[PDB]
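From the pipeline queue, job 12 of 40. The input is one protein chain; the requested action is below.

Action: predict structure.
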Amino acid sequence: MSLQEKLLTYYRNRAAIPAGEQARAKQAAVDICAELRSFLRAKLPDMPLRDMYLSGSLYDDLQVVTADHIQLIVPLVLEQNLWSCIPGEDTIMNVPGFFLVRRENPEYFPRGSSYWDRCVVGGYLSPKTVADTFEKVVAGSINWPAIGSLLDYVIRPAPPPEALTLEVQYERDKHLFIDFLPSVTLGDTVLVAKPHRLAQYDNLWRLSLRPAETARLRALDQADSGCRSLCLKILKAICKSTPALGHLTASQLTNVILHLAQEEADWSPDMLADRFLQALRGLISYLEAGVLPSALNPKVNLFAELTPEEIDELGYTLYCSLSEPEVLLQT
């Protein structure tokens, strides 16, 4: 049979979402998203935000390759007057590519001049505070299954520390997750409050990379009708199924593939199996080294959040795969 054929087989059987189901999944998210606006259009203002949006509603599949959960961005509006963002590199700590947001010009515009002065601690805008002030609309200031009833789904938020995340069964067989993620844009630079992990103590703002990451990927495979996304989807599925490998994230996997695209031109369909093995060796190499640089921002190490016991486990599992990759398909 061969790896190629087995990989394709695993794709269709374990990894891929049927066109129909996918559409219905998109519908759910788009509907949930609509109604959450209707909840905040009533509740607010006070908090200054643009409309919530779902990334990337332009693609059907919705970027659930690159991935984790469907992402519901909530853009916080800030005065470009009153706020500068300081790179994590130039701290006061030392943590690329996270950023501190510094309250500027008390020198001019005293406290109370912004809504966002109520989420400052120590001269700096605080993703955790911001996330919290937020999380106490979610789990559960919402009249939750009243919107469940309206649309014929089950909508319940995961219990903390993911009160931001939501579970929705869209059909009876299947279920689906939606992340709320607060975002601020200060000039060129866009940031999200996905907390760091340790964060020292608590904590900095995270540079958003998923949308750029998914755009390169979309584009490369457009260029040459190549098999980069397919190869990624399969690694993602294997990692979702194989408990040892669960510690690996969408972003990590995505960046392994992007580095491999930098190194290899070919990605014709018949190259799947080789590129697949190379991703495994790439992973092993990045894990040995303890660093996976972001393809888009080489100073950022995506493996910096992994605990060393995780790295340990992953490396061993991958090391053992290499001679019989077939075993990864039967988890």
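Job complete. DSSP finds nine helices and eleven strands in the chain.
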